[PDB]
């Protein structure tokens, strides 16, 4: 199936507190397996997958030096934002940004992205066609005319179409035996009285992978999407996910619901039935 | 891999 | 080195066509740059290449070959001013530059 | 654009020598290269900001300081014969379109 990969960057400013705080990590579809933290004791990029621990000591100086750059490279942006806006010079304030590239089944290009924030709402992100970009208020067209000048859009492109689908590949050889495969949900049913009126029933979906799952309620093949009480996929630690959902029913009547899982680790749909 | 231009906002 | 330049020097006439060629040993390379530096200047950029094909801009021509790692430089229409040293940069893993020996073009008015 | 002091000088074996780089393309990264004659440019320091420095391909016998984002200094503790060279100095980015080169320092160390 396709694949991508993705770093996702975190710097907080802490004006008088000491240095701005730099958390990068790296993701290949839903498995990390890279980070750094400024304020960490290694100060170097830590491993955070199995099948990444074999890269040799020249890929963790380089990855650690080159995330340390773009630390940097935040410090001043901070500093350079503040301005545009017109903010107090001791309030804290954050930037994201978020880049990466997708792959297909054979392994070939599909898309690459790279988006900017400030503040969590976007301040410049590059379009689809990695050639121009797109700004979102007036103070990311200061940003985006240095770019434009500076062929930044060209730059970035070479990374996405270049280095970063080679490493994608690379990584997705690497771990076959973890990144490749699918871990189909541990489903079943509970039953839950509110009262001796009314009853409520959850479906569940246990150490699943990805995290890509639908479940959905039917009251005799009717959708009960407005009565469902639907929870966000949440992780379970283990690099697995988890998930369930609710519906109200009446005391006599819980044959009639039925729930419905739909995941791409099951050959087929399942039918959870009480 | 690490490729974020830091072209500088 | 890390980077094959060639040739050393070049001698060709008013309008002649001036090709030069670069290699780079390493197989982790993404880009490549190409330098001008008149004797006892600074050097400035010519032009870059990062994709396989050709890319014109005025009377230069840039060509790259990624599956073999070699770039070229031509110059259409040599003029004196063209006489100076040529300097071939490839990119690191690092985000660093590789720099090559150097071709010396000497151009006959 | 990028300026460099001094241009010229002559040092003695065993004397101090510092060369001042200074930008206002307000560029992240900075460079000293060393340019000598079969070798091209070799990369001996650079800083991906203010307050660090990171050696290069060449750091013995040298060194480099960044105090703001604007100067950066290549401070030759013991000038030896077989440090004389041209210098030159670069601004640019992480992933930058291009390095923007000083117009180069002409360093003689004499016995």
């Known amino acids: 199936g396709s694949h991508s990969m993705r770093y996702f960057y975190t710097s907080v400013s802490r004006p008088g507190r000491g240095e701005p705080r730099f958390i990068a990590v790296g993701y290949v579809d839903d498995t990390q397996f890279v980070r750094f933290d400024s304020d960490a004791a290694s100060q170097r990029m830590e491993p955070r997958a199995p099948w990444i621990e074999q890269e040799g000591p020249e890929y963790w100086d380089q990855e650690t030096r080159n995330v340390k750059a773009q630390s940097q490279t935040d410090r001043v942006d901070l500093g350079t934002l503040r301005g545009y806006y017109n903010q107090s010079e001791d309030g804290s304030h954050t930037i994201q940004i978020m880049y990466g590239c997708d792959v297909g089944p054979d392994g070939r290009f599909l898309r690459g992205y790279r988006q900017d924030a400030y503040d969590g709402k976007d301040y410049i992100a590059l379009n689809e066609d990695l050639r121009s970009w797109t700004a979102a208020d007036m103070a990311a067209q200061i940003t985006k005319r240095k770019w434009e000048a500076a062929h930044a859009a060209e730059q970035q492109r070479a990374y996405l179409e270049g280095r970063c689908v080679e490493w994608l590949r690379r990584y997705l050889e690497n771990g076959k035996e973890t990144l490749q495969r699918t871990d189909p949900p541990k489903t079943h049913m509970t039953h839950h009285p509110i009262s001796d009126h009314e009853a409520t029933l959850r479906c569940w979906a246990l150490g699943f992978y990805p995290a890509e799952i639908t479940l959905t309620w039917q009251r005799d093949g009717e959708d009960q999407t407005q009565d469902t009480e639907l929870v966000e996929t949440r992780p379970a630690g283990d690099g697995t996910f988890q998930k369930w959902v609710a519906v109200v029913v009446p005391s006599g009547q819980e044959q009639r619901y039925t729930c419905h899982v739909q995941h791409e680790g099951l050959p087929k749909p399942l039918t959870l039935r009480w | 891999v690490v490729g974020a231009v830091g072209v500088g906002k | 080195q890390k980077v094959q330049q060639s040739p050393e020097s070049l001698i060709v006439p008013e309008g002649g066509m001036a090709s030069l060629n670069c290699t780079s040993s390493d197989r982790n390379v993404d880009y490549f740059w190409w330098y001008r530096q008149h004797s006892g200047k600074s050097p400035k950029m010519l032009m870059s290449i990062f994709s396989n094909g050709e890319k014109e801009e005025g009377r230069f021509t840039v060509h790259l070959n990624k599956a073999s790692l070699h770039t070229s430089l031509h110059i259409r229409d040599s003029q004196p001013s063209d006489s100076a040293l040529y300097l071939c940069?490839?990119?690191?893993?690092?985000?660093?530059?590789?720099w090559g020996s150097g071709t010396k073009l000497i151009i006959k008015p | 654009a990028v300026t460099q002091s001094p241009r010229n000088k002559v040092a003695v074996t065993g004397g101090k020598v510092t060369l001042s780089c200074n930008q206002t393309n307000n560029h992240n990264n900075m460079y000293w290269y060393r340019q000598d004659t079969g070798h091209g440019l070799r990369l001996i320091h650079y800083?991906?900001?203010?307050?660090?420095?990171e050696k290069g391909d060449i750091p013995d016998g040298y060194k480099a300081s960044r105090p703001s984002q604007e100067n950066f200094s290549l401070i030759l503790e013991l000038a030896t014969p077989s440090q004389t060279s041209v210098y030159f100095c670069?601004?640019?980015?992480?992933?930058?379109?291009?390095?923007?080169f000083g117009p180069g320092t002409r360093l003689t160390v004499l016995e």
């Open positions: 800083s991906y900001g203010a307050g660090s420095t």
């Open positions: 940069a490839a990119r690191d893993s690092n985000y660093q530059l590789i």
């Open positions: 670069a601004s640019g980015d992480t992933g930058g379109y291009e390095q923007y």
